[PDB]
Amino acid sequence: PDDDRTHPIPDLTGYITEGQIQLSRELHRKGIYPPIDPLPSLSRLMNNGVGKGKTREDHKQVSDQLYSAYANGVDIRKLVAIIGEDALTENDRRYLQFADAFERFFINQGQQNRSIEESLQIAWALLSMLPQGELKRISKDHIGKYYGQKLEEIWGAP
Amino acid sequence: PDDDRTHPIPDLTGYITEGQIQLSRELHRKGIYPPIDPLPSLSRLMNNGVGKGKTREDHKQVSDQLYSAYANGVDIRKLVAIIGEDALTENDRRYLQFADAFERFFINQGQQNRSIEESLQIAWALLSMLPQGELKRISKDHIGKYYGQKLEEIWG
Amino acid sequence: PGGDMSEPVTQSTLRIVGAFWRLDASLAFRRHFPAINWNGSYSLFTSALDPWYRENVAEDYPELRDAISELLQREAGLQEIVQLVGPDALQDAERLVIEVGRIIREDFLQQNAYHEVDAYCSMKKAYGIMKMILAFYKEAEAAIKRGVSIDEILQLPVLERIGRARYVSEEEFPAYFEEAMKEIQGAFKALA
Amino acid sequence: PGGDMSEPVTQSTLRIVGAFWRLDASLAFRRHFPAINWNGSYSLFTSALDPWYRENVAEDYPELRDAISELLQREAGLQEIVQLVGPDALQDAERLVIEVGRIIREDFLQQNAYHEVDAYCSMKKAYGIMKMILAFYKEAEAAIKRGVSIDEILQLPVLERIGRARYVSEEEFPAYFEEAMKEIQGAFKALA
Amino acid sequence: PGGDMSEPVTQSTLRIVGAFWRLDASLAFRRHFPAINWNGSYSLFTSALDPWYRENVAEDYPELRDAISELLQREAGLQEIVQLVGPDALQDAERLVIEVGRIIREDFLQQNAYHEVDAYCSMKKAYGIMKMILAFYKEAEAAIKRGVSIDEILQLPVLERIGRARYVSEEEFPAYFEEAMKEIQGAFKALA
Amino acid sequence: VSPTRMNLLQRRGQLRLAQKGVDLLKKKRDALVAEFFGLVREAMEARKALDQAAKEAYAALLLAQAFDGPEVVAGAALGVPPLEGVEAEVENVWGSKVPRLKATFPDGALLSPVGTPAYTLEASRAFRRYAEALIRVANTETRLKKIGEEIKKTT
Amino acid sequence: MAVIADPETAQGFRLAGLEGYGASSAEEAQSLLETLVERGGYALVAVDEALLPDPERAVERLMRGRDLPVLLPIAGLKEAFQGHDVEGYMRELVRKTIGFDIKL
C-alpha cells in the first residue's frame, strides 16, 4: 500500500509462501525493464531444482558469485560520488564497472525471450570483467571451462 | 492544541475559510511583535484586491520574491546547524543576513501604524541587499524603477 | 484529513485511477507552484501515447522526456548526501548535476497560473525549453572535462536566457529559441 | 502520564491559566532544583506589575530583568555550537557569555528549600544579586578588549563572593552587597 | 516479524526460559553458520553442570572453556581500533590475539550441518580442539616474547592442521590429536 | 510531530538514510587513513634526508670556521642580501587549501663568485642544499597535519 | 625564511642567503618568535628543538587568525653530530594526530 513491508497483507503472505520477487522503483525510473531487484529477492526452493541433471551444473555457484559481486559494487557506486573515481583502488573500479554493466545488460532485457543457456552465457560474459581468481565461490573446473568469454556476444548483438 | 496544525479543528477550519494567519512561538520567544510566521500563512483573495489601479503595480511580484528569498534563508539556517557557519559561501551568507534583517525589521514593528507605501518601501529596501541578477520573479522594468534603496537612511 | 495520505478514500481512489498527481504542502509554503510532488506521482498512459507524440510533436520527444527524467532521478539520489556532508563536499560533476536539477525545477516545472503569458504553454514550447536545457547540460559537462570550474560556468549570461524563456509569447518563441541555441554555442566555445 | 505534555488535562488547563510553570526531568535527576524550564515557561502578568516594581523595589528593576533574560537567551543559543565544535573554537567573548550564564544558572536560579537561610529570599536581595552579576559581566567585558584572557578573569577571587552571596542572611546582606561591589571595582582595576 | 527482539512473543518467552540462543542476520549474510551471536546469548546452567563436566570429560574443562571465552572477549574490545586503522599497523601483542580470534571463529565455532562428519561432534573432540588452540596461543605468545616477527608465525603449516580438525573422523581423532600436539611443539621449538 | 501513519513511514525512511550515511562516512575515513599511512613514509624519508644534510653542513661549517677564520665568515655572510620571497601557492587536499611553499631563490643571488675562501663557498653550497631539504620537509608536514584533523572531523 | 638558533650557526644561514637570528634560551626564543609573528613577510620559521620543542604551540593564541607562516622544529646543533631517531619522533607525531599510540 505504501511500499510498506510491515503491512498485514505482505506480512502474512511471507508466512505462507516460499520466497519473494521484489520490484524496484528506482530501476523503473531509470528505464530498466523488467525492474526486478536482485538484493531483497529470495527463493526458498532454488537448491532442489537447480543442479546437475536438471539444468547446467554451474548454476548455484554462478548465482552466488553474481549476488556477491553486485552487492559489493552497489556501495562503491555511492562512494565514488564523494571520493572520486581516481581515488579508488583497481578492484573497486572493476566492481563499479561490473555493477554498471550488470544493470545495463543482465536485468534490462526488454521483451526478449531468453533460454536458460543464453542467460548463463550472459552471466559468464559479465563475470569475465572481474579478474580471474577473485571468484572465490566458483570451483576451478567451471572457471577453467567457462571463463574468458567476451561481452561482445550481447554487446554487438543486443 | 499543542501547536498542532493537523488537529481536527484547525484542519476543518482551513478547509472552509479563505486563508489563515498563523503565529509562531519561536518568534514570540525572541521578542518580535507581532509574531506572525509568513510561510504557513495564506490569503486566497489577494489577487483580486491588488495590482495596477488598486494599490500599486509591483505588489504581487515583490510579495512573491520575498517569499522565495525567505524560504532560501530558512533552508540555509537549517544547513548551518549541520555543517557549521564558517563553511558557507558568500551567496548563502547573503540569504542568511537577509533572513535575519527581515525578521528584525519587517515583521517586528510594535504598535506603530504603517501605510502600504511605507511597507513597500521597507520591502524594497530589504531586497536591495541581494544581487540584482537574483531577482527572478520581478520584471526588469520594476527593478529599474525601484531597486537601489538603503535601509539605514529611514531610521538613521 | 490532516494531509494523511493513508486515508481510506485516498487508498480506494489510488487503486483505480490511471494517473496520480500528488501535491505537497512544503512546496506550497515556499510559493512553488503547481507544487506537484515529483517523487510520489506517476502516470500509466505514457507508453500508449508515444506514437502520437512522434507524429505530432517531434520524432525525438520521448528520448528528451526520458533524458529529463534521468536527470531528476540522479538529482534525487544525490540529495541524501548533501543533507549529510553539505553541498560543497561533492565533486564537480555532482555539483553540475545539482545545479542543472535546480535549473530544471526553477524554470521548467514551475508555472504561474496568474501571469498573462505563462498561464498557458503549448507542447512545442515545452519541447524547445527541454532541448535548450539538455544542450546546456551537455555543453557544461563537456566543458568540465576541459578543467573549467563549476562556479565559473553558472556566471554565464546564457542562464538568464533559459531562466526567462517561460514568459516569451507563443508567436515570439521561435526566434527566441534559435537565438538561445546560438548563444549556447557562443558561450562555451569562448569560455576556455 | 510519563511526562507527556500533550495529554488532555494539561492542554485543557493551559487555556485558562495566566501563568505556566514548566518542570523538567532533565534538571531534577542531576539535582538542579527548583528545576524550572525557563525556556518553556511563561507568565502573562509581567507587564501589569511594572508600576508596582518601579516604586517598591527600584526604578531600573525591569531593565535588569530584561538584561538577564537576554543573557540567558544568548547562552542557550551558544550551547548548541559549543556542543558540536568544542569549547576551544569559541572566541573569548563567547567564552565570557558561557561562563556568565553558568554563574547565573548556578547562583541566581538555583535555590535550596531546606537550607535555613536559602529557603526565603526578599526582593531586594535578588535585586542586589542581579546588580552584582551584571556589574561583573560589564567589567569582564571591558577587560577583554584590553587584552586580558578569560583564563585570568575566572581565577579572580571575587566570583566566589558572588557565589556565596545567596547564603547570606537578610540582616547581613546590605553590608555584604556594598563590600562585594567595592571588591569587584577594585579587583577589576588592579587586574592588568 | 522484523528481526526485532521487542516483539511481545519474544519478551514473554525470555522471562521464563533458562537459556537464550540469539541468531544474527549479519552472520547469516556472511554465511557463518550457525549464526549464533555469542554476545547477546546467555545460559544459566553452566555452574550446575560444572561437577558433571570434570568427571566425564576432563578435569581441566571448566577452567579451559573460560580461557577461550576470555580470548573471544579480548578480540571484541579491539574492534574500535581495527575499524579505524588496518590490522597491519597493530603491534604483535594484539595482532596475535586477532589471529587467534579468527582461528577460533573459523575452526571451532563454525560448523556445517550438511557435511558427512562435521554434522556431529562429541565432547572429547571439542575438548581436543580447544586444547590445540590454547597450546598454539601459548607457544605463539612465547615466540613473540623471544623477538620473532608475526609474519613467520602465520606461515607455519600447523595452522592448516587445526583447520582440518573439524573434518577428521570421530574414531580417527585420538591419533590426529596426539600427532598435532607433538607437531606444534616440534615446530615452535625450532623457531628463532 | 503529529502521530500519523505517513509520519511513521517518513521516520523509518530517515532512520534508513542515517544508517546508510554512517557506513558511507566510515568508508571515507578508511580512505583517509589509507592516504595518511602512505604519507607518513614520505615524511620520514624527507626527515632523515634533512638530518643527513644538516650533519654534513655542520661538518663543513666547523672546519670552515677554523680554516678561514670567524671574522672572514662573518664578513662573507654580510655580503649577501637575504631573501624572503617564496611562492606560497595553495594546494587542495579534500577541499581544504594548504600552503605549498616554492622557493624563488636563484643560484646567482649570492655575491662574490670568486671564492678565495673556498671552505666558505662550500659551506654556502651545503647550507643551500640543507635549506632545500628543509622546505621539502615543511611541504610534507603541512599536508600530514591537515589530513590528521580531517580524520578527526570525520570521526 | 627565518631561522632561530644559537649564534654558533646563525651566520651560516646568512651565508645561505637567508635571514637568521641568534638565541640562547627558551625566553630569548619565545621573545624572538613573538617579535617575528607580528612582523610580516615571514613565510617559514625554523626553531631548534633544544630551544623550543613545540614551535607552533608557542604562537597558538596569535595564530588562530592566520595561516601563512609555517613553523618547523629542526635538529640541535651538537645533537646533529651524534644524530637522533627520526622514527621515534614519528611515534610522538602519530600519537598527537590519531591518539592510539599504535604504529608498526
Q: Where are the domains of chain G?
A: 1-100
Distance between CA atoms of residues F100 and F92, nearest Å: 10
Distance between CA atoms of residues E162 and E157, nearest Å: 9
Interface mutation vs chain F, best among G1, G81, G85, most F CBs within 10 Å: G1
Judged by CB atoms closer than 8 Å, whether chains meet at A78 and F9 is answered as no
Distance between CA atoms of residues G88 and G72, nearest Å: 17
| E81 and chain F in contact, CB less than 8 A | no
Phi (first) and psi of residue D91, to 5 degrees: -70, 165
Element (H, E) at E146: helix E123-146
Judged by CB atoms closer than 8 Å, whether chains meet at E85 and F155 is answered as no
Q: What angle do CA B96, B101, B103 make, to 5 degrees?
A: 100
F-chain CB neighbours of G39 within 8 Å are: none
Distance between CA atoms of residues E35 and E24, nearest Å: 5
Q: Which residues of E51-88 are buried (b: 16+ CB within 10 A; e: fewer)?
A: eebeeebbeebbebbeebeebbeebeebeeeeebbeee
Distance between CA atoms of residues A129 and A150, nearest Å: 9
**Residue A137: CB atoms within 10 Å:** 15
Q: Is F146 helix (H, G, I), strand (E, B) or coil?
A: helix
Instruction: Choose among G86, G10, G15, G83: nearest CA to G51.
Output: G10
Instruction: Choose among D55, B7, C117: nearest CA to F4.
Output: B7
Judged by CB atoms closer than 8 Å, whether chains meet at A81 and C6 is answered as no
Of F5, F6, F17, the CB nearest to C80: F17
Å between F29 CA and nearest CA of chain E: 8
- The three grid cell numbers given for residue D127, joined into one nine-digit string: 535585586
**Residue G14: CB atoms within 10 Å:** 23
Looking at the DSSP assignment, which residues form a beta bridge with residue C20?
A: C42
- The three grid cell numbers given for residue E4, joined into one nine-digit string: 526485532
Distance between CA atoms of residues F41 and E89, nearest Å: 13
| D6 and chain B in contact, CB less than 8 A | yes
Distance between CA atoms of residues B145 and B132, nearest Å: 13
Q: What angle do CA E77, E81, E86 make, to 5 degrees?
A: 130
Instruction: Choose among F109, F86, F46: nearest CA to G72.
Output: F46
Residue whose grid cell is 622546505 = F135
Q: Which residues of A63-98 are buried (b: 16+ CB within 10 A; e: fewer)?
A: bebbeebbebbbbbebbbbbbeeeebeeebebbbeb
Looking at the DSSP assignment, which residues form a beta bridge with residue F100?
A: F89
Amino acid (one-letter) located at D32? H
Q: How many residues does chain C have?
A: 192
Segments in C57-91 forming alpha helices (H): 61-85
Distance between CA atoms of residues B86 and D23, nearest Å: 36
E19-20 and E42-43 strand pairing: antiparallel
For helices E92-104 and E62-77, angle between their N-to-C axes, nearest 10 degrees: 120
Residue whose grid cell is 577461550 = E68
Instruction: Choose among E54, D34, G100, D15: nearest CA to F33.
Output: G100
| C90 and chain A in contact, CB less than 8 A | yes
Looking at the DSSP assignment, which residues form a beta bridge with residue F51?
A: none
Closest residue in B to C110 (Cα–Cα): B137
Residue whose grid cell is 539520489 = C77
- The three grid cell numbers given for residue D56, joined into one nine-digit string: 517598591
HEC string for D67-116: HHHHHHHHHHHHHHHHHHHCCCCCCHHHHHHHHHHHHHHHHHHCCCCCCC
- Show the domain range for D173: 44-191
HEC string for C115-127: CCCCCCCCHHHHH
Q: Which residues of D45-62 are buried (b: 16+ CB within 10 A; e: fewer)?
A: eeeeeeeebeeebeeebb
Judged by CB atoms closer than 8 Å, whether chains meet at B84 and D84 is answered as yes
Å between A53 CA and nearest CA of chain C: 42
Resolution to 1 decimal, in Å?
A: 2.8
| D80 and chain B in contact, CB less than 8 A | yes
- The three grid cell numbers given for residue C126, joined into one nine-digit string: 515545452
D and E make contact (3+ CB pairs below 8 Å): no
DSSP F6-68: HHHHHHHHHHHHHHHHHHHHHHHHHHHHHHHHHHHHHHHHHHHHHHHHHHHHHHHHHHHHHHH
Q: Is the dihedral of CA A113, A119, A121, A124 positive or negative?
A: positive
Measured CA distances, B116 to B35, B60, E73, E139 (Å): 19, 13, 74, 91
Sheet containing strand G20-22, edge to edge, reads G20-22, G2-5, G44-48, G70-74
Å between D84 CA and nearest CA of chain B: 9
- Give chain F's contact residues with B (Cβ, < 8 Å): 2, 4
Segments in chain G forming alpha helices (H): 7-15, 26-38, 79-82, 86-98
Residue whose grid cell is 555452574 = E47
Distance between CA atoms of residues E175 and E161, nearest Å: 13
Element (H, E) at B38: none
Interface mutation vs chain E, best among F22, F23, F33, F155, most E CBs within 10 Å: F33
E-chain CB neighbours of A6 within 8 Å are: 1-2
Catalogue the E-assigned strands of B6-71.
19-20, 42-43
Instruction: Choose among A158, A102, A104: nearest CA to A128.
Output: A102
Measured CA distances, A95 to A90, A101, A102, A130 (Å): 9, 10, 10, 7
G20-22 and G44-48 strand pairing: unpaired
DSSP A37-61: -TTT-EETTHHHHSSBTTB-TTHHH
Judged by CB atoms closer than 8 Å, whether chains meet at F28 and A79 is answered as yes
Instruction: Choose among D186, D130, D117, D138: nearest CA to D158.
Output: D186
Q: Is the dihedral of CA A134, A138, A140, A141 positive or negative?
A: negative
Residue whose grid cell is 536591495 = B128
Judged by CB atoms closer than 8 Å, whether chains meet at F4 and B4 is answered as no
Amino acid (one-letter) located at C67? A
| B47 and chain C in contact, CB less than 8 A | yes
Q: Is B42 helix (H, G, I), strand (E, B) or coil?
A: strand
- The three grid cell numbers given for residue F61, joined into one nine-digit string: 661549517
Looking at the DSSP assignment, which residues form a beta bridge with residue F91?
A: F98
